[PDB]
Design a protein around this ligand. Structure first.
Ligand SMILES: [Zn+2]
Ligand SMILES: [Zn+2]
Lengths: 209, 50, 107, 50
């Protein structure tokens, strides 16, 4: 140990910050290009590094939309996040007035805790991510095409040009890894740029439902 | 346009080459058999000796 | 190791005694105390292989050499002949011409 | 004694057999892994694998 754990932590942090960058939140270029040596300078050993409190991120505010809107990232120490830690994070976000949170589980989560996270509060939106999936970026994969979230007016002009409805567009599950990666709400349509065999690109659209 | 029995018969040099190739192949197969049964035979990577 | 009792020939198990562990039988009071070390190894099979493959020397275990392929017309070749067709009376060829890593694969 | 040799100590339990395939490219010979498993997440998550 003390060598693979810190590397996993650095790579998960890089993947999470790239995810936040893809969603359009405030991230600096220094955090974008962060080598393993920078994380070692931050913490070079496993006991020196704190998963529950040192790895937390709170500077995530929408540079495009609003500095008031804020996202938080949690890294629970225990492998199976209990409902106690969930309630602690909930009251912390209530005190800090943060309605968007992400959690990085280590090995799993209790079913009661899963149900609670599902229906803890309609105003507080919390996402779950396994640390195993976060070891690699889904967007950087060559098989996965480029996905861009569309706005309301873009979907409107699309349906006007194609003379369609929302329910007639192709569907995509909300539990899709890409859907959780982008945090897409139900009812939105995303454009997908498939790389063709030639120089051209195929443009398609999928409704998150 | 016709085909006859003379169109498929082998030639003298063809028979000589066939005999020589059969002899060489039988000798090489016997060498391989003797190498595998008695002694060590070069094992192709990714498979067993037989 | 399977041990048997001289009294009835049944299986002997290990059981903790008042002074020392001993082999005992579930049917007769016959017991046998242990004095020194008694071991029984198994020696399982070790994975001595390395699993290396794909070498060009081992790959070229083919017959066809110095032929004319219908793609680049170069000596090197790697032919496969198949006869598993009853609807199509003739046989079936599959040529693999590869010296400069062309990767020719057709029928 | 019966169930101890069949315990996992290193690797992914879903992985059964993995082999090292090589490519004979003239530019450079590269190595890939052919895994006879059904856990792609664990394969892509392991260290040293692109
Ligand atoms: Zn007995
Ligand atoms: Zn050729």
């Amino acid at each position: 140990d003390d060598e693979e754990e810190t590397y996993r932590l650095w790579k998960i942090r890089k993947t999470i910050m790239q995810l936040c960058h893809d969603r359009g939140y405030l991230v600096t270029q220094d955090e974008l290009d962060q080598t393993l040596e920078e994380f070692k300078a931050q913490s070079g050993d496993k006991p020196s590094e704190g998963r529950p409190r040192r790895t937390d991120l709170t500077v995530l505010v929408a540079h495009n939309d609003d500095p008031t809107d804020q996202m938080f990232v949690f890294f629970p120490e225990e492998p199976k996040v209990g409902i106690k830690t969930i309630k602690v994070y909930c009251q912390r976000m209530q005190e800090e007035n943060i309605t968007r949170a992400l959690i990085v589980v280590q090995q799993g989560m209790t079913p009661s805790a899963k149900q609670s996270l599902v229906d803890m509060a309609p105003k507080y939106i919390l996402e779950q991510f396994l640390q195993q999936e976060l070891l690699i970026n889904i967007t950087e994969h060559e098989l996965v095409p480029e996905h861009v979230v569309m706005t309301k007016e873009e979907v409107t002009e699309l349906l006007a040009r194609y003379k369609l409805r929302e329910n007639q567009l192709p569907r995509i599950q909300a539990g899709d890894p890409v859907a959780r990666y982008f945090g897409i709400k139900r009812g939105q349509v995303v454009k997908i740029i498939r790389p063709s065999e030639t120089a051209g690109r195929y443009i398609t659209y999928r409704l998150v439902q | 346009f016709s085909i006859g029995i003379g169109d498929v018969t082998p030639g003298q040099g063809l028979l000589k080459a066939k005999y020589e190739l059969l002899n060489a192949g039988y000798k090489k197969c016997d060498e391989y058999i003797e190498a595998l049964n008695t002694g060590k035979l070069q094992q192709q990577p990714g498979c067993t000796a037989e | 190791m399977l041990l048997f009792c001289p009294g009835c020939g049944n299986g002997l198990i290990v059981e903790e005694g008042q002074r020392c562990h001993r082999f005992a039988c579930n049917t007769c009071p016959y017991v046998h105390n242990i004095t020194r070390k008694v071991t029984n190894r198994k020696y399982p099979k070790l994975k001595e292989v390395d699993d290396v493959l794909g070498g060009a020397a081992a790959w070229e275990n083919v017959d066809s050499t110095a032929e004319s392929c219908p793609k680049c017309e170069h000596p090197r070749a790697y032919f496969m002949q198949l006869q598993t067709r009853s609807a199509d009376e003739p046989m079936t060829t599959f040529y693999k011409c590869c010296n400069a890593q062309c990767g020719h694969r057709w029928r | 004694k019966e169930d101890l040799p069949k315990v996992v100590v290193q690797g992914i339990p879903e992985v059964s057999r993995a082999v090292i395939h090589i490519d004979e490219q003239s530019g450079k010979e590269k190595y890939k892994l052919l895994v006879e498993g059904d856990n792609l997440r664990a394969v892509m998550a392991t260290h040293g694998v692109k």
